[PDB]
Amino acid sequence: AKAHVATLEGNYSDIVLGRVVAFGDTGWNFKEVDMTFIADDADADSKTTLFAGVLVGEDGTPATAAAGVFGVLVDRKVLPGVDHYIGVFEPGEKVPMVLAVRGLTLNQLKLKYADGTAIDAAGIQALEAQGNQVTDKIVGTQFIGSVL
């Protein structure tokens, strides 16, 4: 009794809840950075460890402390439900990634550090230095089996 099963959960717009759009440029909120996709140890045919919402520094190193947080990685290559880039990049390659920096209202429950740990309260200060709002007022949702 085993069947091949796949699932999808979320979307892109649940991380960047709101965004200020400038007349002059529609792309002054973001910043493109050069990021390593596959580590230098894992063989070529292995899934990437990054995910949408990982805090990264300017130098492309995924954030590990509140002192290095610079932006949120929201590139379209790591959105949920893609899974088709396995084995396309050999280990150690460096690929551009789109970060989101300025003029955003960002969810907190999905922002995480390198290892998946939640964002520290003192890490919010660094992210709001760029002029962004970290909001927790998310209604959420409740599926079958629940009352209401």
Add this chain to the structure above:
Amino acid sequence: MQNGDFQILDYTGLISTMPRVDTLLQSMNLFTEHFGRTTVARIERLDDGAGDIKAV
């Protein structure tokens, strides 16, 4: 009929039997019938709900 080589009997017919068959479940028609074309099938599921709004 004949008994042995010289005598006779009286032949009185045949007996027969056949066991029971339980059709209870099939009678009340639970299962729908869908004639496929191959030996693999796929089923998809989707579900949505609601939330607990707060005040500001």
